[PDB]
Write a protein that binds this ligand. Structure first.
Ligand SMILES: CC(C)CN(C[C@@H](O)[C@H](Cc1ccccc1)NC(=O)c1cccc(O)c1)S(=O)(=O)c1ccc2ncsc2c1
Lengths: 99, 99
């Protein structure tokens, strides 16, 4: 689809059979989800945002379906203010900026 | 134009006699610029993201040129690590997400 920006670009995602709302976030390098359980090994990671750095858990090769489009890649889990889909998965689903 | 997201969507913006590189950021409600001594009235504000909150100064009705497209609107000025063009201005230059 084409998504305008007068409202937050929130989309439904499907991850581990669970539905969540997440923000399509072109300013984010990474995909970062609020606290949740995911299966498998994770690695401790630190990332930086506007307010400083936080600790996250890094899960690799996680399937997520974003607004009906399939991605498999890195998902970080931690104290993000909102679920965000970043460029690592935005590229997988073929998302571009257009004006 | 179409901007892919393999790399950060940085573009050149102009605000007065200052050209700066800024992120086209669909995840940002508001436009946040690195410290600069803009003329005119402003109001204090705090905005939050990954890592917590920062203190910014809100300036209203500031003209900004973004890739040769004219915009005018609210700009938040503060200790952000990157210049961020938010939805308030992305809409004005006709920016959409597409996949
Ligand atoms: C986390 C998001 C919900 C919000 N952030 C926008 C993200 O795209 C930020 C942009 C950014 C900030 C600092 C440095 C670089 C880029 N991106 C990230 O937090 C982010 C960046 C890189 C990696 C990563 O994992 C996350 S934001 O920058 O924190 C932001 C911006 C505008 C705004 N207006 C009102 S509240 C508000 C918050």
């Amino acid at each position: 689809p084409q998504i305008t920006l007068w409202k937050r670009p929130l989309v439904t995602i499907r991850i581990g059979g669970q539905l969540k709302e997440a923000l399509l976030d072109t300013g984010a390098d990474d995909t970062v989800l609020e606290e949740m359980n995911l299966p498998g090994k994770w690695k401790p990671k630190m990332i930086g945002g506007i307010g400083g750095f936080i600790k996250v858990r890094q899960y690799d090769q996680i399937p997520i379906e974003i607004c009906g489009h399939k991605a498999i890649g890195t998902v970080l889990v931690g104290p993000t203010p909102v679920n965000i889909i970043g460029r690592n998965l935005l590229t997988q689903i073929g998302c571009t900026l257009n004006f």
